[PDB]
Amino acid sequence: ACDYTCGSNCYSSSDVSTAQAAGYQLHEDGETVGSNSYPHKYNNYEGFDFSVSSPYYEWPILSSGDVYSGGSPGADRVVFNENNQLAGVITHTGASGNNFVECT
């Protein structure tokens, strides 16, 4: 069974924790990756009821199981805070335009 389901993509906790770690590392180092420069702040315009505090940061998680290193980030994201706390897993799948919805 999936720990997180983003549209048709299925993630375990281990996929999440690996993505997140990659992301937080760049963050800590003040480096970015991709044309969209990940990781970058997540404003929470959506108003998700996250249980950890802001600031929030978004980082792609890939259905391939690989760590994001550039190119298309797909639709799914991990959201972490300043404390390397998992805020949640979100996606553009099933959300209009460029909005997000949560993975279930």
Ligand X SMILES: Nc1nc2c(ncn2[C@@H]2O[C@H](CO)[C@@H](OP(=O)(O)O)[C@H]2O)c(=O)[nH]1
Catalytic, 27? Answer no
Residue 66 engages ligand X in binding (rule: CB under 6 A): no
Q: 31 Cβ partners below 8 Å, 6+ apart?
A: none
Q: If contact means CB under 5 to 8 A according to the sort of partner, which of Ca ion, ligand X, none does residue 15 touch?
A: Ca ion
Q: Which is nearer to ligand X, 21 or 34 (CB)?
A: 34
Q: If contact means CB under 5 to 8 A according to the sort of partner, which of Ca ion, ligand X, none does residue 37 touch?
A: none
The closest of 25, 2, 18, 26 to 62, measured between CA atoms, is 18
Q: 27 Cβ partners below 8 Å, 6+ apart?
A: 39, 57, 80
Binding site for ligand X (CB under 6 A): 36, 40, 42-46, 58, 73, 98-100
